[PDB]
Structures are given as C-alpha cells and as structure tokens.
Amino acid sequence: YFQGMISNEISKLDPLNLDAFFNQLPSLNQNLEVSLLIDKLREITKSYLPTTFSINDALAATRDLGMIMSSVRKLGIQPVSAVSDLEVFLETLSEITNMVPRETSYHYGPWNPIGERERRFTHFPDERGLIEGVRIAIPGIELAIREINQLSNLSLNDPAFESLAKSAALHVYQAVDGIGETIKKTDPYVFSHELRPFFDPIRIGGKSYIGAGGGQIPLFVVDVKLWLGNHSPNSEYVSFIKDSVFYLPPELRPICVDSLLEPSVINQKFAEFGSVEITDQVIKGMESLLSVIQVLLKFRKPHFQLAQRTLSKENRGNYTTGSAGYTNSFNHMVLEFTIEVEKQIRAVLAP
Numbered sequence: 001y002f003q004g005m006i007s008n009e010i011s012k013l014d015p016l017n018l019d020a021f022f023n024q025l026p027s028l029n030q031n032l033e034v035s036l037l038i039d040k041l042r043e044i045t046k047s048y049l050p051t052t053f054s055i056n057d058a059l060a061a062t063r064d065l066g067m068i069m070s071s072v073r074k075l076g077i078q079p080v081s082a083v084s085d086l087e088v089f090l091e092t093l094s095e096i097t098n099m100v101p102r103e104t105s106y107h108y109g110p111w112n113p114i115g116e117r118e119r120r121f122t123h124f125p126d127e128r129g130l131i132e133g134v135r136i137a138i139p140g141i142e143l144a145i146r147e148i149n150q151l152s153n154l155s156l157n158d159p160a161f162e163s164l165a166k167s168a169a170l171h172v173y174q175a176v177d178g179i180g181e182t183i184k185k186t187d188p189y190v191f192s193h194e195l196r197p198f199f200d201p202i203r204i205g206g207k208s209y210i211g212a213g214g215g216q217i218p219l220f221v222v223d224v225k226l227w228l229g230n231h232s233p234n235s236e237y238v239s240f241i242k243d244s245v246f247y248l249p250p251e252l253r254p255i256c257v258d259s260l261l262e263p264s265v266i267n268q269k270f271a272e273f274g275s276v277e278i279t280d281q282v283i284k285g286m287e288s289l290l291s292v293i294q295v296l297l298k299f300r301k302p303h304f305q306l307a308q309r310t311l312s313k314e315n316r317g318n319y320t321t322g323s324a325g326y327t328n329s330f331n332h333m334v335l336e337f338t339i340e341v342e343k344q345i346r347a348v349l350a351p
C-alpha cells in the first residue's frame, strides 16, 4: 500500500520556484554567500504552505530545500538552528512524504532533473560523477529487488527461476555502469575537498540526519534478500542496514524488514540444491545466483579502489569517512562478505 514514487513525475517539478536559484547556487557556494542562503530558507518558510502539497510536490520540495540546507551546513552552521521556522516546515513535509526531512541519493539522482534544471552544489564537473552514478544505479537496483523477491517462490528446476535471476544480474549491472561513470568523472582529490563537505549531518527536531550518500542506493536491500538474511545478527552491516531502513522510500521498507527476518534466497536454495534431484536446469538456476553475486562484485571491487584513492593521506582532505560515518574498512567488510558467498556457491557447484 505504498506504490507509485515515479522519478520523472518528481524530477520535472519545481514546487518552491527554485529553478533560477539553482542556476546560481554553485556561484553562491563558491563565494561563501551564506546570507543569500539563509534569506532563501526564510523566504521559503513564509512563501509556501507545505500542507497544501501533493506527495510528489513534497518529495521534490524535500530535494530542493534539503540541498539548500546542506549548503548552509557545509559552511558549519546548523540551518535549522539558524532558521528556526524550518523545523515545522520540515515536520509538515515529512508527514506527507513519510520520509526523513532531508534529501537522500534518491532526491540527488533519479528525482533530480536531467539537463539545465539539474540541481548541483558546485560548478565542478566532478560532481556530475556522483549524480549520474546514483541516477543510473537506483532504478536498475529497484528492478532487481522485485525480481530477486520472486526467486523464493520458484524452483531451481523451473527455468523461470533462471530467467528471473538473469534479469536481476542485468538490472544490477546498472550499478556497475554507474560507478564507472563516477570513476571516469570524479577526481578523488576534488571529491574530498570540494564535494564531500555538502554531505554532512543536520540536526532536525532533536535528531541528526546524515547527508545524501551512494550507500543509500538500495543495494543493501538486494544483499539482505539475496545472501545476508537473518544469518549474521550482530554484524556491523546489519547495524548499517538497520540505520538505513527508514531513509528508504516507504515502498521498500517492508521488503527490507521481511528480508532481515527470514533466511536468504541463497541459504534457502543451498538447501533445495543438496536435497532435490539435481538436473541440468537446476545447475543453471544455481549458476544464475552466482551470476548476480558476480555482478555485485563488479560494482564493489572498483568502488573499494576509488574509495581507497580518495581516503588516502594524499587525497582525503578534512575527512576520514563517508556520509554515514564509516571508513573504507566498512566497504572492505561488505566486499569480503560478497566474496565469501561467491566462494560458497562455487563450492556447491564443484561437481
């Protein structure tokens, strides 16, 4: 009962009439023009009644208001503390979106218009590497989620299982396309120095909300359904996912929650494999699961490398963490998790 967060219906809206302002935002930020930032926040709280907004209006308004707030926070000022009327404006908006009162990578990517209206913090072309990265990744991962969700109720011997899993790996490849756009467009040093500071936490109604981040693409939702399940309860990754659930669009929360409380597909299919008549289609089915896992590795291995060149002493600037407060050890932990799964499947397929 959440369906219908359609990206092009949100990307096209300018509910707070900020299109002109966003063409100036990169120069406002370059020149440290905090006063114009505060003015615009003040103007917004007096110019609009957010209770009047449709759901799509509020999503797009969160995107735009969030990025102005992020630009204030960049300089070191908590924007809700400086503009106290924001707090009820952000309360009203999140009642409608049933999402956090802050922009996430959904707002920064798929819900961010292509072309002249594209919302950007800076004039640096490196910023386009992040935006295109998540704009490409997210719709593909979402498609993969719905496909992997259907694997639980299909038999390994059913060729519909193999086809579904193959569609999922192809959809996940969009995350691979996306990090490749980043690697080719975003210099690590420019990231740490020019872009990362727009992704810091903001205090809203007595709680801190992290900035938008690539880690907010719903890839962890693929992981929990596909291989993590309820199998590593006190793990660091489970704690990250736990902290991420209510950042997700509402439509994805049930899938994530159910999956954290259930055996994973691969654990379920490892049992069916070594307990039923192993046929040629059954091997294809099992091989389609290793295909998905191997596509996840084609994202995580170059991601780890880019994060390592960025967080090196040479390039890291004032930061040792991503927006969610972790170092590259966390990326190493997810990649080693995924490598272990690939190892296990290969071992089950060895004869």
Ligand code: HEM
Binding pocket: 129, 130, 133, 134, 137, 175, 178, 179, 182, 186, 187, 188, 191, 213, 214, 215, 216, 217, 219, 220, 300, 303, 306, 307, 310, 311, 321, 322, 323, 324, 325, 326, 327, 328, 330, 331, 334, 335
């Ligand atoms: C210079 C660019 C980038 C750097 C330095 C970087 C670094 C990091 C770091 C340090 C984390 C740990 C979590 C955190 O602290 O927030 C993380 C998480 C993550 N980021 Fe990035 N990242 C970059 C670009 C991207 C892009 C463009 C995407 C998506 C298209 C992405 C996808 C992810 C994912 C999925 C995770 C969760 C871990 C996983 O699923 O393997 N990253 N990243």
Ligand SMILES: N[C@@H](Cc1c[nH]c2ccccc12)C(=O)O
Binding pocket: 105, 108, 130, 131, 133, 134, 196, 199, 212, 213, 214, 215, 216, 322, 323, 324
């Ligand atoms: N993926 C990293 C770096 C990052 C920060 N903001 C982003 C926006 C888009 C893509 C990646 C990022 C993170 O989640 O912290």
